[PDB]
Design a binder for this molecule. Structure first.
Ligand SMILES: Nc1ncnc2c1ncn2[C@@H]1O[C@H](COP(=O)(O)OP(=O)(O)OP(=O)(O)O)[C@@H](O)[C@H]1O
Lengths: 235, 237, 244, 39, 85, 239, 241
């Protein structure tokens, strides 16, 4: 019976559900897992890079990207939708800086990206299907470090610690167990890397992960091979 | 059925449209909210959901122009679109007429806007039920608007999943209204939401959202610790 | 069937099943009646308060479209509101265009135009509600018309639309409308509404009236509280007399 | 209603029989039993 | 009796409720009029399911229970979706 | 019925028709690309033609600019359209900003073009895969690969088309810094990797070479014959 | 060969537009009937009236409309479509007079309406509105004219015709009458039309259950015959038959 109520994004099922939106939410899973953690010292993003074969130089699997000098976006889903939404986020941050001569709040930028993702089939904007990608915006603003999760349905919500991607269900419980409100950035990094090792196919070693941090201070930083090895030494 | 509910533009062979009914059912897929008013105050109280214990609670009450707020029950997308439309309309009304927009006219415009998609196959019906609590020169107003472009002027109403219990409570206690202070009004609303909630749980400062407007009182939203003065004094079952 | 989908395909019999379904939908809502007395017109409607939470005056089904025209709706209230807005907008255009008040016959013709335009195409559905226009003027007497999903504008001395339309028409037929005055035709309307209303099924009930006539100086408006109270009292007394 | 079905009659409800296991059906049923084998 | 010459095409729902709750320990305070109000066309089969689930709530949860039973006949597991509805 | 629509999702969350476009790509003659220290090379299988057919009208290697070349695998008409638009945009970018296009920029533009064509419902995806090999304005042997789904990555050496998997595995095994130390070992590796699919080695091979600050050069068939002779001699000697 | 029926622009394997045929079937759906007949120097239309109630306003209820100051039309079929087509014809006639400076010939108006109907048939945007429209008028040169605007764009001119449920029987009677002494007086043509209606409906008409419109060379203005005039004609013809 679920074959006539999901031919279009603008068709309601008897349960009053947007099955196409639900289907895109399901599509979210295919991507590699990402974990973001908020702490009073900042926010940390760690993503399981999923190199399908070596000889692929790592600077093309962009699961963590930079939004302005104060936010980082972790992606899970279609690379095309990832690129489109990342471009929108960057353009919106720069436009807000140009207009109001300030730095957009993480909540505001996530809201703008969600506003772009809202337009499903509205004949007034031209995408026609949900953006099969889930994003984690971790940044620093006047309200202290913050982290937000946005899903294809345009819904965004604050999250002091969240995980998305293929290892979403298995990592959410680990985050719940290991999370106490007060940590340090190093503690969050260690916990996130431990969870990644728990829910990663490969042995966690130097490459195959990416780690980024935004702190009330130095701008968004991508940990290089040296720091990655240093942390992996005593995860 | 099975061939008369594939789009909103086709009449079923019974004098009914099935997509509109499907939207009016989807409206009941959201968290419970209720609203009501005294002779000098209008209030909304709603149960903001938590997707997970880690993730904070998604916001519920949306702050339309200072003399108006709304509570949503339905698709986040349609809720955001309608909230933006409300804000733009109120700003335009304030810009052209140097005075706030009447809530009746606001809800009429919303009804027409939500009706137009219910006829032409160009977009699905707006899947959200709205409780608009506003204050105009006439006095506090509580309005309901449903995806079927039907809007009612309600003295005390509930919407969302498990709204029957709150509606029954409001029916029983409507006699009290119109002669209650703001504290008693919020207590009435909180009791209605407690009744609609299942027994083993309760209302916590974390998960309850309150919004009040009235005389010389622009719309104010209380959440988290802000609601403590209400819950603390609220009586227990 | 196969030919019922979309309103642009004729069935082998030549019937537009979508418009027929629109007629069926309108013949499923609360009842409304109107009568054209000799020097005016009166509308009444049996509103159904689906829940006591609604305040009085909610779901007003007797709109006013331009000062002199009243419009009583029956069917889908969303389409009713949309059609009321269209009627107001057409009347405003006419007043702007011609510097004089819009005749009710012409207004009904324009709204029938609009309804038929909607029922023609295949990307839109036929209007799922009928209605009645009424007006009174010095230079035009009293006029009443009824428009339905198909968009026909037959004139009327009186009419009933909705669930119980045939019984209401039968009751109306036995009245001296051509000579009776507003003050008594209002009471007759209230009596007819109370007679035709089904209490054992519709449960809730409210009686809503309006008129336009010379005594109103040819300006439509709702009933005063006292007049409505007296009319409903007369209707209740007539109902008791019939019950006896 | 295996160790204390009489609670149903105590509360005034009739404890019925007949449950459809429509769908690990076999071993789930065996664990529930933990016997009437059928072909 | 089929589904496709003399063919044949709140109160009744309430009556069905009492009839099927007759062999129970129903408390007198129950407002079967309220139960029938909170029906929205639920036919006699749904009323039977509501009474059966009232008995099942007597089993589990001990036994408001009628409201919960009718809601679970509606099958409001509600499977909370990521998108609001 | 979860198919035959670019803008419809399946339970696993797939876009089956763009996946089908990738499958259509998989049905094209093999094209390998490699990057060296100062040389970037593209090899392509020829498949040969009937003697009555002219050769200059068949192209799998096309120069998108002075410092960027493009190898192709997929549908020929889509190839022509994409290459034409890519050249147009290369020159347009040169106009907009007075700096030659970077390989990353041009491959991103091609990926965006494919994405735009696969977003909507009234358009068919460009059923092609492309390898963009070039030298940035600072000097660097960059190589990217773009798929029909609008996704582009950066590689050091990759093969697309029919023999994609086998040739990629061979490059995986026999790609090393010493194997690309000089500007002849890279070519030898390219012919070695293509010989597992092509038959003659010289009659079914086309090589294009880009050297830093030097225009593209297509290797002569005699030069290819000499090179394949060198590889054969090396193999027999190692035997 | 059954699937070629749900669209207007799909040709059946035998080359048939079943949708336009169904439009004709809808023409034969209003129940009513109408007849038109042209005499030596005048044309007259008469249509059955149905007011099955004392509550309806017979004044407004009608099927005759003056398309302009010298051209009249009788509608049959769906009433909404009839009124829409009548208004379109009125607009076309006014536009013609404005653009060219002389009133629209009846054949011209009929042709324009036919062209509009054919456009609707060809382009799958609207259903072909199912009303059959008969025009009567006076041409300064050719004399009286009568035409049809069936919902397929065919607009042949006539000496006398009928539309509606009983069009076949009316046509048979009219051809029988016209085969002998086709040239008729005003009274003769009115009698022919009325007796055709009476015999084909197997009933005689009271003055209220009938509408008549007339155009004459002497008075080339579409005029609706009043109850008194129609009753006088009825009684005179019945007496003198
Ligand atoms: N919840 C469970 N607990 C223990 N074992 C389980 C469970 N679910 C499945 N299994 C395993 O499944 C097998 C038992 O399943 P069983 O033989 O009943 O098949 P089935 O899934 O009912 O299939 P079918 O009825 O279609 O033949 C055993 O291997 C058992 O270990």
């Amino acid at each position: 019976t679920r074959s006539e109520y999901d031919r279009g994004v603008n068709t309601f099922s008897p349960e009053g559900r947007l099955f196409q939106v639900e289907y895109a939410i399901e599509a979210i899973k295919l991507g590699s897992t990402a974990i973001g953690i908020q702490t009073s010292e900042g926010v940390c993003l760690a993503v399981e890079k999923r190199i399908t074969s070596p000889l692929m130089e790592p600077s093309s699997i962009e699961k963590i990207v930079e939004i302005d000098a104060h936010i980082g976006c972790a992606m899970s889903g279609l690379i095309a939708d990832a690129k489109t939404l990342i471009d929108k986020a960057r353009v919106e941050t720069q436009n807000h800086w140009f207009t109001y001569n300030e730095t957009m709040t993480v909540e505001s930028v996530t809201q703008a990206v969600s506003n772009l993702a809202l337009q499903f089939g509205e004949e007034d904007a031209a995408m026609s299907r949900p953006f099969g990608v889930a994003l984690l915006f971790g940044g620093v603003d006047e309200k202290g470090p913050q982290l937000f999760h946005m899903d294809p349905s345009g819904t965004f919500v604050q999250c002091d610690a969240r995980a998305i991607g293929s290892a979403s269900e298995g990592a959410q419980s680990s985050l719940q167990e290991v999370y106490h409100k007060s940590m340090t950035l190093k503690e969050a990094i260690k916990s996130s890397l431990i969870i990644l090792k728990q829910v990663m196919e490969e042995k966690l070693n130097a490459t195959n992960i990416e780690l980024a941090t935004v702190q009330p201070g130095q701008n968004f930083h991508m940990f290089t091979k040296e720091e990655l090895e240093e942390v992996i030494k005593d995860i | 059925r099975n061939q008369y509910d594939n789009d909103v533009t086709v009449w079923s062979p019974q004098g009914r449209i099935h997509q509109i009914e499907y939207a009016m059912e989807a409206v009941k897929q959201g968290s419970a909210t209720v609203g009501l008013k005294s002779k000098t105050h209008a209030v909304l109280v709603a149960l903001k959901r938590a997707q997970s214990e880690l993730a904070a609670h998604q916001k519920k009450i949306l702050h339309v122009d200072n003399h108006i707020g709304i509570s949503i029950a339905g698709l986040t997308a349609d809720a955001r679109l309608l909230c933006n439309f409300m804000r733009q309309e109120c700003l335009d009304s304030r810009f052209v007429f140097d005075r706030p927009l009447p809530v009746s006219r606001l809800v009429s415009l919303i009804g027409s806007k939500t009706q137009i998609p219910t006829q032409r196959y160009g977009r699905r019906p707006y899947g959200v039920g709205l409780l608009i609590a506003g204050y105009d020169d006439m006095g506090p107003h509580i309005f309901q608007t449903c995806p079927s472009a039907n809007y009612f002027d309600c003295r005390a109403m509930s919407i969302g999943a498990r709204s029957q219990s709150a509606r029954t409570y409001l029916e029983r206690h409507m006699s009290e209204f119109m002669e209650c202070n703001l504290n008693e009004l919020v207590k009435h609303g909180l009791r209605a939401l407690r009744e609609t909630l299942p027994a083993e749980q309760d209302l916590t400062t974390k998960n309850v959202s309150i919004g009040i407007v009235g005389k010389d009182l622009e719309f104010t939203i209380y959440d988290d610790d802000d609601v403590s003065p209400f819950l603390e004094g609220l009586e227990e079952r | 069937t196969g030919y019922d989908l979309s309103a642009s395909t004729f069935s082998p019999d030549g019937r537009v099943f979508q418009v027929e379904y629109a007629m069926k939908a309108v013949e499923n809502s609360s009842t409304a009646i109107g009568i054209r007395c000799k020097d005016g017109v009166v509308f009444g409607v049996e509103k159904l308060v689906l829940s006591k939470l609604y305040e009085e005056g909610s779901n007003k089904r007797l709109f006013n479209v331009d000062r002199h025209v009243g419009m009583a709706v029956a069917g889908l209230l969303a389409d009713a509101r949309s059609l009321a807005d269209i009627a107001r907008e057409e009347a405003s255009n006419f007043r702007s265009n011609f510097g004089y008040n819009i005749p009710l016959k012409h207004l009904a013709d324009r709204v029938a135009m609009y309804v038929h335009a909607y029922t023609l195409y295949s990307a839109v559905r036929p209007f799922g509600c009928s209605f009645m226009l009424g007006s009174y003027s010095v230079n035009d007497g009293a006029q009443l018309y009824m428009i339905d999903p198909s968009g026909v504008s037959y004139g009327y001395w009186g009419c009933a639309i909705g669930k119980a339309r045939q019984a209401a028409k039968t009751e109306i037929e036995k009245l001296q409308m051509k000579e009776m005055t507003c003050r008594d035709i209002v009471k007759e309307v209230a009596k007819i509404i109370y007679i035709v209303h089904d209490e054992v099924k519709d449960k809730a009930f409210e009686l809503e009236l309006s008129w336009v006539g010379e005594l109103t100086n040819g300006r439509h408006e709702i009933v005063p509280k006292d007049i409505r109270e007296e009319a409903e009292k007369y209707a209740k007394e007539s109902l008791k007399e019939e019950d006896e | 209603p295996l160790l204390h079905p009489e609670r149903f009659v105590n509360l005034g409800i009739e404890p019925p029989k007949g449950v459809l296991l429509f769908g690990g059906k076999t071993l789930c049923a065996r664990a529930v039993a933990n016997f009437i084998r059928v072909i | 009796a089929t589904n496709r010459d003399r063919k044949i095409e709140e109160e009744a729902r309430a009556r069905i409720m009492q009839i099927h709750s007759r062999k129970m320990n129903v408390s007198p305070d129950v407002n079967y009029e309220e139960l029938a109000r909170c029906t929205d066309d639920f036919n006699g089969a749904q009323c039977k399911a509501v009474c059966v689930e009232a008995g099942m709530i007597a089993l589990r949860r001990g036994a408001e229970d009628y409201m919960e039973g009718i809601l679970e006949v509606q099958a409001k597991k509600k499977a909370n979706l990521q998108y609001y509805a | 019925s979860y198919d035959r629509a670019i803008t419809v999702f399946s339970p696993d969350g797939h876009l089956f028709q763009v996946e089908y476009a990738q499958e259509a790509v998989k049905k094209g003659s093999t094209a390998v690309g490699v990057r060296g220290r100062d040389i970037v090379v593209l090899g392509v299988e020829k498949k040969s033609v009937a003697k009555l057919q002219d050769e200059r009208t068949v192209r799998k290697i096309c120069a998108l600019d002075d410092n960027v070349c493009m190898a192709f695998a997929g549908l020929t008409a889509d190839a022509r359209i994409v290459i034409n638009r890519a050249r147009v945009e290369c020159q347009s970018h040169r106009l907009t900003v007075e700096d030659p296009v970077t390989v990353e920029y041009i491959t991103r533009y091609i990926a965006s073009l494919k994405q735009r064509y696969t977003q909507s419902n009234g358009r068919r995806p460009f059923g092609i895969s492309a390898l963009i090999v070039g030298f940035d304005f600072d000097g660097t042997p960059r190589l990217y690969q773009t798929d029909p789904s609008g996704t582009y990555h950066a590689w050091k050496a990759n093969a697309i088309g029919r023999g994609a998997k086998s040739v990629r595995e061979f490059l995986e095994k026999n790609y090393t810094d010493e194997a690309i130390e000089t500007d002849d070992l890279t070519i030898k590796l390219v012919i070695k990797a293509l010989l597992e699919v092509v038959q003659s080695g010289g009659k079914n091979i086309e090589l294009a070479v880009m050297r830093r600050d030097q225009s593209l050069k297509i290797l002569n068939p005699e030069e290819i014959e000499k090179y394949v002779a060198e590889i054969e001699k090396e193999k027999e000697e190692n035997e | 060969s059954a699937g070629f029926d749900r669209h207007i622009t799909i040709f059946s394997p035998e080359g048939r537009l079943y949708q336009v045929e169904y439009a004709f079937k809808a023409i034969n759906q209003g129940g009513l009937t109408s007849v038109a007949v042209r005499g030596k120097d005048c044309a007259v239309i008469v249509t059955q009236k149905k007011v099955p109630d004392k509550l309806l306003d017979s004044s407004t209820v009608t099927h005759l409309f003056k398309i302009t100051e010298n051209i009249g039309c009788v509608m049959t079929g769906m009433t909404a479509d009839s009124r829409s087509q009548v208004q379109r014809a009125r607009y076309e006639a006014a536009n013609w007079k404005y653009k060219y400076g002389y009133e629209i010939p009846v054949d011209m108006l009929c042709k324009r309406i036919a062209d509009i109907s054919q456009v609707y048939t060809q382009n799958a945007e609207m259903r072909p509105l199912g009303c059959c429209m008969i025009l009567i008028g006076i041409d300064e040169e050719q004399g009286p004219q009568v035409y049809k605007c069936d919902p397929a764009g065919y607009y042949c001119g006539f000496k006398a015709t009928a539309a509606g449920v009983k069009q076949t029987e009316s046509t048979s009677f009219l051809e029988k009458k016209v085969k002998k002494k086709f040239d008729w007086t005003f009274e003769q043509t009115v009698e022919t039309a009325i007796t055709c209606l009476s015999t084909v409906l197997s009933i005689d008409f009271k003055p209220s259950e009938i509408e008549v419109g007339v155009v004459t060379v002497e008075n080339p203005k579409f005029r609706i015959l009043t109850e008194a005039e129609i009753d006088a004609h009825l009684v005179a013809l019945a007496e003198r038959d």
